[PDB]
Amino acid sequence: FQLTHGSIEHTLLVPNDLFFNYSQLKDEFIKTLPEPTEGFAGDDEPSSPAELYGKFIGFISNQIVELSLKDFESRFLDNNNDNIHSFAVKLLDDEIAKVKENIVKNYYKAVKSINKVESNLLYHCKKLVAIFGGQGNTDDYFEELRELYTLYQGLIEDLLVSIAEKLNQLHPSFDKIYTQGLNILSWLKHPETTPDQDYLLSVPVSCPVICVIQLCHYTITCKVLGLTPGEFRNSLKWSTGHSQGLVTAVTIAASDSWDSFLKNSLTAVSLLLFIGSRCLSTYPRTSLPPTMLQDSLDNGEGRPSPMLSVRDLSIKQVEKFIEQTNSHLPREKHIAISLINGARNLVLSGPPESLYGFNLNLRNQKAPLDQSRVPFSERKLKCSNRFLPIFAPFHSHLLADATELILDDVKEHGLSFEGLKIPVYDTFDGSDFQALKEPIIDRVVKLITELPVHWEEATNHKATHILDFGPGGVSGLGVLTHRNKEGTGARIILAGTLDSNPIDDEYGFKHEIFQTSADKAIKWAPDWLKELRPTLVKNSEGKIYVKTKFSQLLGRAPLMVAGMTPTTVNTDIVSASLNAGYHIELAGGGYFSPVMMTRAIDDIVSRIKPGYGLGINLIYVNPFMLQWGIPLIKDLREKGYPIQSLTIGAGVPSIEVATEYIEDLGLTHLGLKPGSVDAISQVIAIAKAHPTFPIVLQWTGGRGGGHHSFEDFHQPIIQMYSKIRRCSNIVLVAGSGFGSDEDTYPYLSGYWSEKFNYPPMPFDGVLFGSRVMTSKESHTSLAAKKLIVECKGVPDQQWEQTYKKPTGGIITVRSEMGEPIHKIATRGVMFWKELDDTIFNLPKNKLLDALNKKRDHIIKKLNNDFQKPWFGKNANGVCDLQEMTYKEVANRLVELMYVKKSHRWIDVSLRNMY
Amino acid sequence: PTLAGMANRTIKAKYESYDAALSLQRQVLCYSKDAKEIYYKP
Amino acid sequence: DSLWQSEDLESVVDEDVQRTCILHGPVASQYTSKVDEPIGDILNSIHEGHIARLIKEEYAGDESKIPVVEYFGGKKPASGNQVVYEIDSELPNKQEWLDLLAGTELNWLQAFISTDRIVQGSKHVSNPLHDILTPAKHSKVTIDKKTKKLTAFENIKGDL
Amino acid sequence: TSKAPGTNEPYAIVSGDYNPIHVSRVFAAYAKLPGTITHGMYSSASIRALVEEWAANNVAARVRAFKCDFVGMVLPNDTLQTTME
Numbered sequence A: 001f002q003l004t005h006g007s008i009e010h011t012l013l014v015p016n017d018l019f020f021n022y023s024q025l026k027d028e029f030i031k032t033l034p035e036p037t038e039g040f041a042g043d044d045e046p047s048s049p050a051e052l053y054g055k056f057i058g059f060i061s062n063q064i065v066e067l068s069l070k071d072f073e074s075r076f077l078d079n080n081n082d083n084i085h086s087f088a089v090k091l092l093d094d095e096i097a098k099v100k101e102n103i104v105k106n107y108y109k110a111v112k113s114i115n116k117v118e119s120n121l122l123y124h125c126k127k128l129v130a131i132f133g134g135q136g137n138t139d140d141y142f143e144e145l146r147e148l149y150t151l152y153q154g155l156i157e158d159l160l161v162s163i164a165e166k167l168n169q170l171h172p173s174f175d176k177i178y179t180q181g182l183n184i185l186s187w188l189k190h191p192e193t194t195p196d197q198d199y200l201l202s203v204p205v206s207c208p209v210i211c212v213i214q215l216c217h218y219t220i221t222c223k224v225l226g227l228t229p230g231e232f233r234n235s236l237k238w239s240t241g242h243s244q245g246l247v248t249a250v251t252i253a254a255s256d257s258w259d260s261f262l263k264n265s266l267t268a269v270s271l272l273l274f275i276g277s278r279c280l281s282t283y284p285r286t287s288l289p290p291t292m293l294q295d296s297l298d299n300g301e302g303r304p305s306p307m308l309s310v311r312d313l314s315i316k317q318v319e320k321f322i323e324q325t326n327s328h329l330p331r332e333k334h335i336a337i338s339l340i341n342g343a344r345n346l347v348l349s350g351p352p353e354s355l356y357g358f359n360l361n362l363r364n365q366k367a368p369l370d371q372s373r374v375p376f377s378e379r380k381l382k383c384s385n386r387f388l389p390i391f392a393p394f395h396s397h398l399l400a401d402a403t404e405l406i407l408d409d410v411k412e413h414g415l416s417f418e419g420l421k422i423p424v425y426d427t428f429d430g431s432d433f434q435a436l437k438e439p440i441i442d443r444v445v446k447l448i449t450e451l452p453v454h455w456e457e458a459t460n461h462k463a464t465h466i467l468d469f470g471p472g473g474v475s476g477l478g479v480l481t482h483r484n485k486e487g488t489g490a491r492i493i494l495a496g497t498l499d500s501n502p503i504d505d506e507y508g509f510k511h512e513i514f515q516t517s518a519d520k521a522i523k524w525a526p527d528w529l530k531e532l533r534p535t536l537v538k539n540s541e542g543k544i545y546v547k548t549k550f551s552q553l554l555g556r557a558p559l560m561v562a563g564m565t566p567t568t569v570n571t572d573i574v575s576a577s578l579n580a581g582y583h584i585e586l587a588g589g590g591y592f593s594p595v596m597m598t599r600a601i602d603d604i605v606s607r608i609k610p611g612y613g614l615g616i617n618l619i620y621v622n623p624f625m626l627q628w629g630i631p632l633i634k635d636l637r638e639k640g641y642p643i644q645s646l647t648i649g650a651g652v653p654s655i656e657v658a659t660e661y662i663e664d665l666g667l668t669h670l671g672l673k674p675g676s677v678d679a680i681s682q683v684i685a686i687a688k689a690h691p692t693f694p695i696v697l698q699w700t701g702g703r704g705g706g707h708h709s710f711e712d713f714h715q716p717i718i719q720m721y722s723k724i725r726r727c728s729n730i731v732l733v734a735g736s737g738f739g740s741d742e743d744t745y746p747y748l749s750g751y752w753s754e755k756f757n758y759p760p761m762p763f764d765g766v767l768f769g770s771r772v773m774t775s776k777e778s779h780t781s782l783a784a785k786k787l788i789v790e791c792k793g794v795p796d797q798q799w800e801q802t803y804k805k806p807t808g809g810i811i812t813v814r815s816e817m818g819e820p821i822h823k824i825a826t827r828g829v830m831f832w833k834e835l836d837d838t839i840f841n842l843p844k845n846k847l848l849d850a851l852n853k854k855r856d857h858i859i860k861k862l863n864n865d866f867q868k869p870w871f872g873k874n875a876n877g878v879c880d881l882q883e884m885t886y887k888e889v890a891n892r893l894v895e896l897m898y899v900k901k902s903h904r905w906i907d908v909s910l911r912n913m914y
Numbered sequence B: 001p002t003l004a005g006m007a008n009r010t011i012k013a014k015y016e017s018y019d020a021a022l023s024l025q026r027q028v029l030c031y032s033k034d035a036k037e038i039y040y041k042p
Numbered sequence C: 001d002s003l004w005q006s007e008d009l010e011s012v013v014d015e016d017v018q019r020t021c022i023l024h025g026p027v028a029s030q031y032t033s034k035v036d037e038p039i040g041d042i043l044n045s046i047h048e049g050h051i052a053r054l055i056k057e058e059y060a061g062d063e064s065k066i067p068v069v070e071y072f073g074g075k076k077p078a079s080g081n082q083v084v085y086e087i088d089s090e091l092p093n094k095q096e097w098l099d100l101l102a103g104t105e106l107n108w109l110q111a112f113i114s115t116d117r118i119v120q121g122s123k124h125v126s127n128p129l130h131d132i133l134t135p136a137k138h139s140k141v142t143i144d145k146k147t148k149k150l151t152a153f154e155n156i157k158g159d160l
Numbered sequence D: 001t002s003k004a005p006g007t008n009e010p011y012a013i014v015s016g017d018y019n020p021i022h023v024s025r026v027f028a029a030y031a032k033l034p035g036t037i038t039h040g041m042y043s044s045a046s047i048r049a050l051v052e053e054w055a056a057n058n059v060a061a062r063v064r065a066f067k068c069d070f071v072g073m074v075l076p077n078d079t080l081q082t083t084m085e
Ligand SMILES: Cc1cc2nc3c(=O)[nH]c(=O)nc-3n(C[C@H](O)[C@H](O)[C@H](O)COP(=O)(O)O)c2cc1C
Pocket: A562, A563, A564, A565, A566, A567, A587, A589, A617, A619, A648, A649, A650, A673, A700, A703, A704, A705, A706, A707, A735, A736, A737, A738, A739, A767, A768, A769, A770, A771, C023, C024, C025, C026, C027, C028, C029
């Protein structure tokens, strides 16, 4: 057979009379197909041979249909016969969603009864968890049910028809608030009959429809796998829901054989109908002043709603703001915590006017700002608050008086959930609904109307697989809870929508639940404690090493000495520190030409044992360093020197620079210490560009060091760890104020994040820059070492106030280029700080005048306090360079450039100047 | 505007959160400068 | 050029430390307390402390429970006795072929095949094996035993 | 924009103005006016709702003298572009 359209065709082996009948159906089918669009980028034009086959079988679906079904399944669904979604997304990734959903629909139209247990990798290995979304997940929620009805007709048409009759029967029960009805079938089948999104979003309407979406997704997950609800629910470890989905969760827990499942769906739908109608009757939303919504809109804000979502702020801060607004509002238009989606994700219920005033206060207090040049302790807080698409203040006192009415109305219809099989986690208290003295429906109604939602506490799961059946999908509850459980080993599957999988492959999808091959069907999110656990290992000689992602590459301990221009330019410190068996990167900052760098590298190579390897550190701020050092490193590598690593200092290079550094010069790994969230993003992009080349980060918080890109050591690596570990070749090591096992072990084992309430976040290694100064191998002067030791330290919380005074004998000073340097508060360093606070900060004209007026004072200060004295001084007396005889100039040059005790000049170039 | 300015900074120092919560859009106007707003002549 | 003074203090004016600027970390200064001790000693103390924490926590304080390998290193972060591999030209991945020849155990031949670099008198040059064992078309390879020996044959002048 | 109601029964019931020309087809046909036109008082109240909404800020203190004249005529399910300045 030649079923074809454009440059695609499919071959079917048909019996003779069957071939005549198939030819009849084929000319009839091409009578309906459209012409090629020169790319198959149209609407009804198939873009794949199997898309054409699906169109053909769907046409017949309005003996040959079985043949086409079997041929299609054998040709394209290789063991994924029930998993047409997997094929659809295979087309999306390799071969848009409209045609993918169309092939899915045509296949499901064609199939016979699907009562066959699908091998979904043992349905994801038998902990299965079912979460249900709530209200406000998405604005255009109704199109979700539109596509659901259109494309899964054979599976949930019966359910939708049942819901339509149930709701049209429920309206006579009490009353109709529904100015445009609630007949869902008419709206779905006739697009013109459907009212506007505002009326659809009105709660008495929307709550039944959101229940419809959840129950439809559950019914699809049952029928596709051929699993009755009574046994699918058994497969689930437990189930719960958001602000609205908890009723669906308890109903699914009460599921049974299909006949009883329809009764369960009736119960859930009637309960949500009563909840929505009673809530709207108790608090009907009113007109909203147009000047007020205009003011809200012209400040980057959405339409005001009875719920306001605030992100990037803690419950305590958000609560303090509500207390201000409530103190200045009457009790009856107060704002209360409606739901706590996470530590930095909240939603607050109340009147839209009260929440608008709330948002005015929050906009006044917030900032737009490029605060990278501002210390972290004094940085203004950022947040992105917006109103959810909802028309009711759920979980607030406004609907509290609707509660008793809801229960009284429920008691008349026999609505009662008693026989729950799986646990249903309480959305507020977190416990199981099974162990409740009061009726389950009473508790759930009180939850949805009055009580808040501590979402994380409710979903304190101990499970591996979670699936969201609610509205929103990508914008729904699954993605929201995935952020809360990124690193705890939880895999969220969005079992309510088919789409191309995330480009970073973070949460699953309908295709992922329905896959049958146990490589994409079974997908586990990273559990950092387990997969980055600091392990131990032993060598043949018996030496014990700490096996991590960092120690594994180096073959030695995961405790490096970072590059240091003053401290790690000596040949001996590098050579002996390496001979101790610890990686150290010789800094180039003390070397100003390739000949000096080559001499130092040669000396270190000669002084280290065979089989050894060192690293080099280069500063990216100065292009001269790069242009003389990168060719030298390439030359030494082509020679075959033991240079193992290149650590690029402050300033992550561009993608092209990282590319040439990774390919041209053959290093084992590339140290790429960033100093900001953006710089970490650049490093991640470089690692993506080179997925196989190891890249050790060496991220430094700027709390300790020399030149510190001032940040916090915790927050950036708290919010970027998740994005850092989605990279097989990024190795995560961090320093910035580490000097002992006591303060490094929590970071190695990941326990450091417990205080922040994040999953354990193990670190591959740690770098020690300031702890190794006092080491005997370092050539820093003994008086300098005594000063380093005698200067006390500063706990982490108090580091950032070093800009103002000597925190533990260390202060921040401005560079010639403006970068801040942490320096011990010596007399010279304090003079430096005084000058860069009082003189160098002034404009040029004011700089010179102030320079003279305070030069009268600076000459003395340079003489008594700084490295560089005033050259004009003679025996004590302050003189200018003009008040100087040639003899005393020469004498001063001897005194200041030639060392008497060592009987040598400081430097040959100084001798040449003399 | 000797009184308009001090009324402005009074509401700023004392009634900022009050105005926010109650959704009060205070418009301080002076005959010297904001005459167009006084006479509704935008 | 203010950084060298802390290293060479015998030259600055009167060898006074307070006149020199020394870079250091406020959070690490509390841990930095001891004068003139070996850098190897410092790093050994840190490593041994970490090993003590790990042995107490994840191994019940028994060193015999630590997994043992002949050599520790050479593993990229982004990654019977008688076997015969007939190499072809269709698609034998270099990495997969070298891994198969290297084997599973962290033994001498595993190191000597999977390692990407060779040392020549303290000189890291390219591994000659990644050139010799490179996929050709007829480089049939054979290991006699898990730790006995390895042999690679080729159809030279029409004779294997 | 304000939209006249699909039927005039609810306004007739609530206001007490049971004039058949608004609800009964036969009486409108007899009166020769074009169909069951909507209540002019419905139109006035619906556009004064626009005034109270936009000109005020949902503030009931601003409700004061509201003159209105039914110059034309409005059918049910009629979309009307109100303008005020
Ligand atoms: C004296 C000194 C010099 C440093 N020089 C450099 C440098 O030249 N290039 C660079 O990227 N980092 C440099 N650093 C930063 C270190 O590599 C490391 O990040 C820092 O010392 C960690 O501080 P901590 O051990 O107190 O936590 C220097 C640090 C110090 C203390």
